[PDB]
Paper text:
The Ras proteins are master regulators of cell proliferation and survival that transduce growth stimuli emanating from cell-surface receptors to cytoplasmic kinases responsible for orchestrating a comprehensive cell division program. Ras proteins are cytosolic, membrane-bound GTPases that bind guanine nucleotides and are regulated by their nucleotide state: guanosine triphosphate (GTP)–bound Ras adopts a conformation that binds Ras effector proteins with high affinity, leading to their activation and downstream signaling, whereas guanosine diphosphate (GDP)–bound Ras adopts a conformation that cannot bind effectors and thus is inactive. Here, we report our initial findings on an alternative approach, one that exploits directed evolution to discover miniproteins having extraordinarily high affinity for the most functionally relevant surface of Ras, the effector domain. High-resolution crystal structures demonstrate that the miniproteins bind Ras as a dimer and interact via a distinct binding mode that captures the Ras effector domain in an open conformational state, which can be stabilized by insertion of a proline at Asp-38 in Ras.
As oncogenic Ras signaling is mediated by the GTP-bound state, we asked whether we could improve the nucleotide selectivity of the 225-11 miniprotein to favor binding to KRas-GppNHp. We prepared a scanning mutagenesis library that systematically randomized pairs of adjacent amino acids throughout the miniprotein sequence and then performed YSD with orthogonally labeled KRas-GppNHp and KRas-GDP targets. After two rounds of sorting for library members with improved selectivity for KRas-GppNHp, the screen afforded a population with a consensus mutation of A30R, located at the miniprotein residue closest to the γ-phosphate in the KRas/225-11 structure. A30R bound more strongly to both KRas-GppNHp and KRas-GDP but with a 2-fold overall improvement in selectivity for KRas-GppNHp. The crystal structure of 225-11 A30R bound to KRas-GppNHp revealed that the mutant arginine residue of the primary miniprotein protomer forms hydrogen bonds with two bound water molecules that solvate the γ-phosphate. GDP lacks the γ-phosphate, and Arg-30 is disengaged from the nucleotide in the KRas-GDP/225-11 A30R structure; thus, this interaction likely contributes to the improved nucleotide selectivity of this miniprotein mutant. As these miniproteins bind with high affinity to all the Ras isoforms, nucleotide states, and mutants tested, further optimization will be required to develop miniproteins or derived inhibitors that are capable of specifically targeting active or oncogenic Ras. Such improved versions may be identified via counterscreening strategies such as that used to identify the KRas-GppNHp–selective A30R miniprotein mutant in this work or the recently reported KRas(G12D)-selective miniprotein based on the Sso7d scaffold.
Author numbering:
A (entry chain A): 1 to 28, 38 to 105, 108 to 164
B (entry chain B): 3 to 32
C (entry chain C): 2 to 32
Amino acid sequence: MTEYKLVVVGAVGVGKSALTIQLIQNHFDSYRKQVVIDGETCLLDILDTAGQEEYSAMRDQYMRTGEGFLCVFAINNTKSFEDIHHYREQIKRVKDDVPMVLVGNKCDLPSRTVDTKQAQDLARSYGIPFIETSAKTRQGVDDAFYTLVREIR
Amino acid sequence: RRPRCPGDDASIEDLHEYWARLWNYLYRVA
Amino acid sequence: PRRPRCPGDDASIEDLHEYWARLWNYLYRVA
Ligand SMILES: Nc1nc2c(ncn2[C@@H]2O[C@H](COP(=O)(O)OP(=O)(O)NP(=O)(O)O)[C@@H](O)[C@H]2O)c(=O)[nH]1
Ligand SMILES: [Mg+2]
Ligand SMILES: [Mg+2]
């Protein structure tokens, strides 16, 4: 019965759509999934944003309805990790203390340029939880979204 | 990829499903 | 709570935006 409007943000190619598709459809169209979080059936509505910047006023206003934000980087893409502050500031701006989860996606891949502590330093520094995920294997995907719910409430 | 409204007699569940599709559609057409 | 009517498949983006917002309010008010 309780609904959560979640927004997924991050650079081009980090796996925002993959995470959304993995959560909802269990694949590697619907933007809504019924989940059970700690015995309570919850409903997750997901906005899967674009990595490509369009400088759109109205896109910011659709983001504004979001209650929580997964900030996704890819662990083998340093530029995508460097982009993270821009997304956190983008979020705080459109929302005017916004619930957030740093997501390090593609943890299945061997060569990683961003280590766990380097990501977790930034996460503790912002005051937000951090989850490693793989849209490919589903590692930590439910954890990521279920943790964002816990962060909103 | 515009979603169609599922009807004036649509269930509340169906309207929620439609709302989430619209949210993404409207975001995308910018 | 007034259920907003289906916007019509020829609706402008502005009209669909209005309907989207009003639908959320409606779904909130009937929950
Ligand atoms: N190995 C691996 N590949 C992934 C993972 N997640 C996404 N990918 C791959 O990364 C590429 C881009 O993924 P996609 O979900 O489109 O990322 P996006 O952030 O939605 N891109 P955009 O911002 O342009 O819409 C795809 O080839 C996809 O298969 C993952 O967890 N592991
Ligand atoms: Mg995508
Ligand atoms: Mg990023």
